[PDB]
Design an enzyme around this catalytic site. Structure first.
Site, PDB file in Angstrom:
ATOM      1  N   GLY A  42       8.534   0.402 -12.768  1.00 17.40           N
ATOM      2  CA  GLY A  42       7.780   1.403 -12.023  1.00 17.40           C
ATOM      3  C   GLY A  42       7.073   0.826 -10.819  1.00 17.40           C
ATOM      4  O   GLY A  42       6.919  -0.392 -10.722  1.00 17.40           O
ATOM      5  N   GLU A  43       6.652   1.699  -9.886  1.00 19.12           N
ATOM      6  CA  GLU A  43       5.929   1.325  -8.664  1.00 19.12           C
ATOM      7  C   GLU A  43       5.174   2.477  -8.037  1.00 19.12           C
ATOM      8  O   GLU A  43       4.027   2.700  -8.389  1.00 19.12           O
ATOM      9  CB  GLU A  43       6.820   0.609  -7.631  1.00 19.12           C
ATOM     10  CG  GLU A  43       8.050   1.372  -7.164  1.00 19.12           C
ATOM     11  CD  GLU A  43       9.238   0.496  -6.805  1.00 19.12           C
ATOM     12  OE1 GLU A  43       9.054  -0.489  -6.053  1.00 19.12           O
ATOM     13  OE2 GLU A  43      10.356   0.799  -7.278  1.00 19.12           O
TER      14      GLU A  43
ATOM     15  N   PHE B 162       0.835   0.391  -3.992  1.00 20.94           N
ATOM     16  CA  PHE B 162       0.044  -0.843  -4.030  1.00 20.94           C
ATOM     17  C   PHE B 162       0.451  -1.792  -5.162  1.00 20.94           C
ATOM     18  O   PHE B 162       0.205  -2.996  -5.069  1.00 20.94           O
ATOM     19  CB  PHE B 162      -1.467  -0.543  -4.110  1.00 20.94           C
ATOM     20  CG  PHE B 162      -2.041   0.250  -2.959  1.00 20.94           C
ATOM     21  CD1 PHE B 162      -1.808  -0.132  -1.641  1.00 20.94           C
ATOM     22  CD2 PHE B 162      -2.844   1.359  -3.193  1.00 20.94           C
ATOM     23  CE1 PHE B 162      -2.327   0.612  -0.577  1.00 20.94           C
ATOM     24  CE2 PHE B 162      -3.374   2.095  -2.129  1.00 20.94           C
ATOM     25  CZ  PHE B 162      -3.115   1.713  -0.829  1.00 20.94           C
ATOM     26  N   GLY B 163       1.045  -1.238  -6.218  1.00 19.30           N
ATOM     27  CA  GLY B 163       1.473  -2.007  -7.376  1.00 19.30           C
ATOM     28  C   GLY B 163       2.896  -1.742  -7.808  1.00 19.30           C
ATOM     29  O   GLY B 163       3.444  -0.668  -7.545  1.00 19.30           O
TER      30      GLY B 163
ATOM     31  N   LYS C 242       3.244  -6.871 -13.874  1.00 18.86           N
ATOM     32  CA  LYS C 242       2.657  -6.020 -12.855  1.00 18.86           C
ATOM     33  C   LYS C 242       2.136  -6.934 -11.749  1.00 18.86           C
ATOM     34  O   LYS C 242       1.426  -7.891 -12.038  1.00 18.86           O
ATOM     35  CB  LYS C 242       1.550  -5.099 -13.407  1.00 18.86           C
ATOM     36  CG  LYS C 242       1.011  -4.131 -12.337  1.00 18.86           C
ATOM     37  CD  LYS C 242      -0.041  -3.169 -12.875  1.00 18.86           C
ATOM     38  CE  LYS C 242       0.231  -1.756 -12.405  1.00 18.86           C
ATOM     39  NZ  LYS C 242      -0.639  -0.766 -13.098  1.00 18.86           N
TER      40      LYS C 242
ATOM     41  N   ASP D  29      -4.413   8.855 -14.914  1.00 20.49           N
ATOM     42  CA  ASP D  29      -2.973   8.908 -14.652  1.00 20.49           C
ATOM     43  C   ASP D  29      -2.184   9.161 -15.942  1.00 20.49           C
ATOM     44  O   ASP D  29      -1.128   8.563 -16.166  1.00 20.49           O
ATOM     45  CB  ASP D  29      -2.522   7.615 -13.935  1.00 20.49           C
ATOM     46  CG  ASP D  29      -1.217   7.712 -13.158  1.00 20.49           C
ATOM     47  OD1 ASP D  29      -0.914   8.809 -12.636  1.00 20.49           O
ATOM     48  OD2 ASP D  29      -0.507   6.681 -13.054  1.00 20.49           O
TER      49      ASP D  29
END
Ligand SMILES: CS(=O)(=O)NCc1nc2cnc3[nH]ccc3c2n1[C@@H]1C[C@H]2CC[C@@H]1C2
Length: 287
Positions: free
Chosen positions: A20-21, A22-23, A44, A136
């Site tokens: 998954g994906e 600033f990070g 991460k 989130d």
């Protein structure tokens, strides 16, 4: 010369795929022996496209959470020059509910879905009791440990609620998952524990629709409000919520389950159900 089992060297970290994906989160194999026998881990890291303090706070939050329904911290990856950090977590091969549910529809029934609901509530209740707001909570962030166990797998937006306060005041809201957000978050940029309850109701709706893209909260809300409003989408979303309009009952979802979901969606945070009540409600349906 002592050994730290929570210290990972970047040299031995071999990227396999993006999770998954600033990070960004990547599946990596930690291979200090260099023979491909090493353990697979979730890593991460920050994207260069500085938010180092944010990632460090996430690491410190996750390092101190110990719950069966919260993804496990394995360690950190730091470079000797003092420039940067990576978060190392356990890797769950079944992925999130988003990948798992469409593939195992025939294996997963209502009873198993309600057990996942209880586990999400338990992980969330543990987080809330430690004065944190997740911000989130969505099915894409709920990992599958096994057919019988789920874990909250990402804490990128998790914030501490300050002492003698009921909420976290949001500043950066550009990439907000608006279709999972309570009106107080969308209108006042305030984050309460009850705002995580609203997001859980939305996640519960995804779980009951087996995470099908055509039945996603975004696809459903855009059909309700209109899919071409652009910069006006949020205002039209807030008006719809102010009118009392909510996501519809999932197909083959009994009303008693749907009524618990509706308690997550009360306009006023104080009128919303708690995770304690949700747990009690689902447990009453499982027996
Ligand atoms: C597209 S996929 O890759 O199919 N499934 C996603 C996935 N799968 C994961 C498995 N293990 C993990 N450990 C920590 C995170 C993590 C995993 N993730 C993601 C990384 C974090 C943001 C979304 C979730 C949690």
């Amino acid at each position: 010369t002592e050994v730290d089992p929570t210290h990972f060297e970047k040299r031995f970290l071999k990227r396999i795929r993006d999770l998954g994906e600033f990070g960004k989160v990547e599946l990596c194999r930690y291979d200090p022996e260099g023979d491909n026998t090493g353990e697979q881990v979730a890593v991460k890291s920050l994207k260069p496209e500085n938010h180092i303090a944010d990632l460090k706070k996430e690491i410190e939050i996750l390092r101190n959470l110990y719950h069966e329904n919260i993804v496990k911290y394995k360690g950190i990856c730091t470079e000797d020059g003092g420039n940067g950090i990576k978060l190392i977590m356990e890797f769950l091969p079944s992925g999130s509910l988003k990948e798992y549910l469409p593939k195992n529809k025939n294996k997963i029934n209502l009873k198993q879905q309600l057990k996942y609901a209880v586990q999400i509530c338990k992980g969330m209740d543990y987080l809330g009791s430690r004065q944190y707001v997740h911000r989130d909570l969505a099915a894409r962030n709920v990992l599958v440990e096994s057919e019988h166990q789920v874990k909250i797998g990402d804490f990128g937006l998790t914030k501490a609620i300050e002492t003698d306060k009921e909420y976290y005041t949001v500043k950066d809201d550009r990439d907000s998952p608006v279709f999972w957000y309570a009106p107080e978050c969308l209108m006042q940029s305030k984050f309460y524990i009850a705002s995580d309850v609203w997001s859980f109701g939305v996640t519960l709706h995804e779980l009951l629709t087996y995470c099908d893209s055509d039945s996603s909260p975004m696809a459903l809300f855009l059909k309700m409000i209109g899919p071409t409003h652009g910069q006006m989408t949020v205002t039209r979303l807030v008006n719809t919520l102010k009118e009392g309009k909510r996501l519809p009952c999932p197909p083959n979802c009994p009303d008693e389950v749907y009524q618990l979901m509706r308690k997550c969606w009360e306009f006023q945070p104080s009128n919303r159900t708690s995770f304690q009540n949700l747990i009690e409600g689902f447990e009453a349906l499982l027996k």
